[PDB]
Design a protein around this nucleic acid. Structure first.
Lengths: 74, 120, 378, 48, 159
RNA sequence: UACCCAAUCCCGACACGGGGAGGUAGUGACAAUAAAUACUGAUACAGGGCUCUUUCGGGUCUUGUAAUUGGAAUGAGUACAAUUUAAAUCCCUUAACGAGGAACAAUUGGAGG
């Protein structure tokens, strides 16, 4: 028959902002930051990512553009 | 017929020790058809071929694809020793051990293929 | 543990042999309970047998036990699921232990041959197995690069021992609480101080004929402790090396202990209408497949697939190995095992088959799946 | 308890005196003296 | 600086580390070893100090498995790096031996006491595994991947 | 404003009596050390995601979702004991419980819509 103290008084949260489930764990945040910065890297340069598959050569699967010179002009 | 033959003084056993290391690291393909498919898919870094094979034309057909794709190849003189080094419980006549972007086996791979390129 | 020297007190040229065989795939190992014998065959049989006395030259089989792979799912079945690989018998004559590639090592009563304990502590396979002499302490070295010592009086596992770099192929023990175990491709014999849990590493690195035929030490297959202070190791490039515990090097290594192999025929090596001997690879040495000793004696029994079983001895300063000759002066096949027994004058059984113990690497159409029992009476 | 927290903030809002001493009792109703020092530490830090 | 941030992020991603304190810790011990190597290169060849101290340093690094057994010069000891140290960590060794599916799975396993190094179980994922002790990394006997009890969710489900 | 002479040591009619040296425990984000707050699949659906020097322009090709489901792993804590010890505690052993977010409840700062 006692008045339990509840969680809001038990830890003085106050008015701290709402943060993310990713932000509560510093490893999982640095896992998801690396997965999206390795993803941003494929949109700039070209990664190797395996050669021809087991099926063989199915064509250059995403376009061939003829008027594009992508060599470092020495 | 096997002109890049490995000689005795601690090169055959360096080859078979690197073979056993890659077989523990699961980076190794065993047998003639798997070596052929790995070279044709281009993932191969080096290929060991037995020279004690009953008729040698199998480990003679593999060097053509290896020379076309320009990967190093070398003959060790015992298929029983090659199977024992892989851990097969059968005699293996062709072994191709592949490439991965992050390992410590690749230092042994690089020194071994430098010695093989000096052998050729 | 008294030292003996019986290398000259035996007449090896006058050895009497029974080269018999029976319905089996390939017999692998034997233990010597002093009246009995215990064979393991790759069909999945462990056969307890009775040997012979002179005052009829084939053993009479008394019992066997077969691996039952149908009851792998079925519990409370001590016993093997697959074929056993090694067997050892306690010198009491009341325990016989056998380990196989079914990831478990079983041990039971020698008489009725009914399985009483099936230890499942190893993680890959059981390759080597050895008893302490005069005690029921067991040393089983495995294929997951570990060696577990068991206290078999209470049927209990007591301790494990790590440290081997590759898979462990053989282990030997003597009257004290020590071991010597050889692992395969790391070229290492480790001497094991079991109570204090420590080891001593011995790294081989072994070094008118063709020069490319001289092969270095590839593996280190077999081991044999000859007394407390030194042992001997046999390696598959045909090297037989005497090692002392006081020294970090080999004490005396002898090379190609069973000679080179024959070069393979042109009629199989090349498929041509002209066979030309201009190209043929250099033959490799036939390495030691089995190696044994009598404890505290001068006897080094080494068997390869040459068809003969060789016997070596120690020097008078016991710091060298010396040849005494071929013993069968054939026992064809691949010599899987050697077991020694003294009548009071020694009977040695040699276990040979068509292939090696652990894998079907070299199958031989020559040779027979035979236990070959020969004795030297002097 | 809520009566303790109620009096603490009633006192702080009305007028804070000099000396307030926390007195922690019923410590003998414990069985593990590791849980005892854990409870002392957490109650001390919440009171602080 | 963006170069330091991208380098430390590449280390923390490529080897499943928790923060940048582990990276700076490894960079500090690497800089200590490399400073010792530079101080030993200051002296001339065939000085006894350089001879025995450099042989001690090279044998130490080869025994702890960082430096390769092929190259054993003090210039390669200078050419050492933090990727080699984080490769010699235990967590990446569990991932590379394939007991775990990813590096974060490996950190999870080492934290909740499944693998063992040799005889004793290891609770810390930054355990610097030596070359002799690299082979004896396996699941412990009290783990459900090793044996014994079928485990926790298994027990609640099989009840 | 903690507990004891139990070890080592000392004094006495003296084996027992007596010791403010000594040892045991408690606090501690001042530092310093190790590292939890999750791991892994399948299916469904959407067609965009990302980037830049040069910007009403160029570059690259698989990415998502508060979607639907499935597996396992479990140490913090709870805790029978036994042990440790002067008596306790810690440590090492250890039976039994102990994870689905609305929780077993990560924070401190800065910039912006």
């Amino acid at each position: 028959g006692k008045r339990q103290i509840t969680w809001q008084i038990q830890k003085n949260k106050g008015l701290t902002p709402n943060r993310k489930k990713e932000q509560r764990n510093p490893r999982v945040k640095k896992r998801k930051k690396y997965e999206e910065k390795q993803k941003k890297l494929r949109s700039v340069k070209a990664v190797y990512k395996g050669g021809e598959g087991p099926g063989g050569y199915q064509g250059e699967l995403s376009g061939i553009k003829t008027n594009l010179v992508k060599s470092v002009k020495l | 017929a096997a002109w890049p033959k490995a000689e005795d003084p601690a090169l055959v056993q360096e080859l078979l020790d690197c073979v056993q290391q890659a077989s523990h690291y699961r980076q190794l393909k065993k047998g003639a058809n798997e070596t052929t498919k790995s070279v044709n898919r281009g993932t191969s870094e080096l290929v060991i071929l037995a020279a004690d094979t009953q008729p040698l034309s199998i480990v003679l057909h593999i060097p053509l694809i290896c020379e076309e794709k320009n990967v190093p190849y070398v003959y060790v003189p015992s298929k029983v020793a090659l199977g024992r080094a892989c851990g097969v419980s059968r005699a293996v006549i062709a072994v191709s051990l592949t490439s991965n972007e992050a390992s410590d086996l690749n230092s042994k791979i690089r020194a071994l293929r430098d010695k093989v390129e000096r052998l050729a | 543990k008294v030292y003996r020297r019986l290398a000259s007190e035996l007449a090896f040229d006058k050895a009497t042999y029974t080269q018999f065989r029976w319905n089996s795939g390939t017999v692998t190992s034997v233990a010597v309970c002093p009246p009995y014998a215990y064979t393991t065959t790759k069909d999945g049989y462990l056969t307890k047998w009775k040997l012979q006395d002179l005052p009829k030259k084939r053993p009479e089989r008394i019992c066997f036990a077969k691996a039952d792979a149908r009851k792998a799912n079925d519990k409370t079945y001590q016993g093997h699921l697959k074929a056993p690989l090694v067997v050892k018998a306690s010198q009491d004559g009341k325990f016989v232990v056998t380990g196989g590639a079914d990831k478990r090592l079983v041990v039971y009563n020698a008489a009725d041959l009914k399985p009483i304990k099936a230890f499942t502590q190893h993680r890959d396979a059981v390759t080597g197995l050895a008893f302490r002499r005069g005690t029921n302490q067991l040393y089983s070295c495995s294929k997951d690069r570990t060696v577990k010592v068991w206290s078999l009086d209470e049927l209990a596992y007591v301790e494990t021992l790590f440290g081997h770099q590759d898979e462990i192929l053989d282990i030997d023990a003597l009257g004290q609480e020590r071991c010597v175990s050889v692992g395969a491709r790391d070229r290492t014999a480790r001497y094991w101080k079991v109570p204090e849990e420590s080891q001593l590493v011995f790294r081989g690195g072994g070094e008118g004929m063709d020069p490319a035929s001289a092969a270095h030490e590839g593996s280190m297959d077999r081991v044999a402790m000859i007394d407390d202070d030194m042992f001997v190791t046999g390696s598959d490039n045909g090297d037989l090396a005497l090692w002392s515990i006081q020294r970090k090097k080999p004490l005396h290594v002898i090379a190609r202990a069973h000679g080179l192999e024959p070069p393979i025929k042109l009629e199989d090596y090349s498929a041509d209408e002209i066979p030309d001997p201009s190209i043929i690879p250099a033959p490799q040495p036939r390495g030691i497949t089995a190696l044994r000793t009598l404890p505290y004696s001068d006897l080094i029994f080494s068997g390869s697939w040459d068809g003969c079983i060789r016997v070596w001895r120690l020097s008078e300063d016991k710091r060298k190995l010396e040849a005494v000759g071929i013993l069968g002066v054939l026992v064809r096949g691949i010599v899987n095992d050697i077991a020694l027994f003294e009548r009071g004058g020694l009977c040695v059984v040699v276990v040979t088959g068509k292939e090696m113990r652990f894998g079907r690497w070299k199958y031989m159409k020559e040779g027979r799946c035979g236990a070959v029992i020969f004795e030297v009476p002097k | 308890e809520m009566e303790t927290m109620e009096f603490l903030n009633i006192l702080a809002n009305t007028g804070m005196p000099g000396n307030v001493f926390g007195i922690l009792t019923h410590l003998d109703l414990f069985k593990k003296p590791s849980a005892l020092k854990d409870a002392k530490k957490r109650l001390k830090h919440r009171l602080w | 600086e963006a170069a330091r941030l991208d380098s430390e992020l590449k280390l923390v991603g490529e080897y499943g580390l928790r923060n940048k304190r582990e990276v700076w810790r490894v960079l500090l011990t690497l800089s200590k070893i490399r400073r010792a190597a530079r101080i030993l290169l200051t002296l001339d060849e065939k000085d006894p100090k350089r001879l025995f101290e450099g042989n001690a340093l090279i044998r130490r690094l080869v025994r702890i498995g960082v430096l390769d057994e092929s190259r054993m010069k003090l210039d390669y000891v200078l050419a050492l790096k933090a990727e080699d140290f984080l490769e010699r960590r235990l967590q990446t060794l569990v991932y590379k031996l394939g007991l775990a599916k990813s590096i974060h799975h490996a950190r999870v396993l080492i934290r909740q006491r499944h693998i063992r190094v040799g005889k004793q179980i290891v609770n810390v994922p930054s355990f610097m595994v030596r070359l002799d002790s690299q082979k004896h990394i396996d699941f412990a006997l009290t783990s459900p991947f090793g044996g014994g009890r079928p485990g926790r969710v298994r027990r609640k489900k099989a009840k």
